[PDB]
Symmetry: D3
Subunit: 129 residues, 6 copies
């Protein structure tokens, strides 16, 4: 109940575009990455000691084909969808600002490009292999 | 059971998003606090509309941190997860131009939100409820 | 050979080099469904009173449901151009400018298709609603 | 009302709905100067064996000053799509997707023109490099 | 001493996207802006007292329409060209990176949008004039 | 008020019309650390044999503690142009072309800054 776990082999996702002023993002060890990608992220509090993670939230992504492991996580599109929704809500508030508008546009165009990968794999017939 | 009562939860629907296996839900718009939804659920789509089959719960920071403390994730955290995974894909056999475009979009989204944050730092109002 | 200009207007764009060819559409008073639909690419060195057609391009006027398939869509023309520029990128003449142009054109299709997908949440696609 | 499809190839693009029309081009073995120049928009409701032409679009093939003006340019079609989208914006059909698309198509024209202006700075306009 | 000049009527151009680590940007006061924009910019050392400016560089922009007032300063396009040229040089070097590539693309598209404006104004015969 | 062009290179760019002004840098042979640092804006109506200086612009050349702060940064000039274009946007000359330009310049600043921030996470910048 210390709201606190051993950092273990979890890797801290540290990226120049993120300030880590309040939160830190961890994922699992690269050695445990399945299918070329990380799938088990933790958002913890940044002022936590480095040997531990103070967990705020866990986010797990679909890992393996739904065909044999079933539905077991979220998709990138789900998270992007939540952000667009929230930002759009702020646009409908006194916090409306141009930076949010650009961010919404970028996120929509992001969804468009990911969708294009999918639609192309349709026209090629190999969807979800 | 795997199902929970849908209740006031509203399904979030975008045409840009497919919906085959997953569904996204937020708390009811009348129940939003601080002008946005903060309590999302991804559930299984093949569920009756009366219910939600929750896969994942995501709760966002409610209220400025400097006034209410850390109690949820930020947009930036989720976007960083998606970036990290797309970059991982690019460093794989499935590197592709669409993923590169999507990374560029997500990074530029982070830069626009970060311009907002920097401006609010300069004005000293970052993490508050000032406008 | 030539035809009379008449009520046809010349479509000038400052972004368009307009060296050897000129573009025309029907008079703006003659537009149906709020847009021009009958375009003529003609030769530039021709009379003011004359258009020397090279090609006619006819867009779908009104809903197919009522007026039948009777013209092309914007998406079709843009598909043509994307195909050609992608062909150039398989050539000695691959250049970054063509790559940018392809990216812009694909993103244009994406925004038009977001409009379509939204109208297909409402089942009003191809209609005048 | 029909022509045989023959060697014409069907342009399938995932960003293109192909709900009511298909776009066809000439065989790749017949592409001249690295690119297709002879496109057909036909009705999607036809057997593969046949094409039901709605419209013919022919692109200038060969240098203009050696073969004369025999077809349209990419910029011509893009100009028409921009013109019609701006008409839509100046109508009840105005929407943000159209504004986005108009922006993208203008930036397309800007990049293609850059290619031109650069080649003129190098003094190499209209040559094989 | 010999370097320092009084800040006086100079405004400091603070932008959250600029780091201000080694330099600061100043311009003439908004009250003195001619033709709706600042034209007299000073890059100075940041590690100065706010009372003074330590000029590193003066940049003076074309002030008043050229047709009317003649050439007396640089244009936005000139400085953007300078920056593009340097960034392209960095791309053609051991220090090639994707961020510079994006910045070059953005600056080029900036030149293209300003140029669409200039094109459109040529066609109207109003380029270089004060006409709207 | 002219000067000899000398070894100075003229920056000839398809995106630049040279209608009123020409931009010049130093000879490629004199480039330090892979880039030009000493630019001149001169009047374009000048024979190739002279430069008609309107303005000199010198960029930070060499490491800062070895040679001092001896010039401007790319970010500074972009900040000037953004400030001017925003002023124009608050004027009778407001237009969509300016707004697009501003957006591009802000995104340019974001990308250059990202390189800086990435380097700082990895422990070296400046
Ligand atoms: Zn863009």
């Amino acid at each position: 109940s210390s709201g606190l776990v051993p950092r273990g082999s979890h890797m801290e996702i540290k990226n120049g575009l993120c300030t880590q002023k309040y939160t830190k993002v961890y994922a699992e060890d690269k050695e445990k990455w399945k299918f070329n990608a990380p799938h088990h992220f933790i958002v913890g509090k940044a002022d936590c000691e480095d040997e531990y993670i103070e967990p705020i939230e866990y986010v797990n992504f679909q890992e393996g084909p739904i065909k044999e492991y079933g539905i077991n996580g979220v998709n990138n599109e789900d998270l992007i969808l939540m952000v667009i929704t929230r930002l759009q809500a702020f646009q409908d508030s006194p916090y409306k600002c141009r930076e949010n508008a650009m961010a919404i546009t970028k996120l929509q165009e992001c969804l468009m490009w990911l969708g294009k990968r999918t639609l192309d794999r349709e026209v090629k017939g190999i969807e979800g292999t």
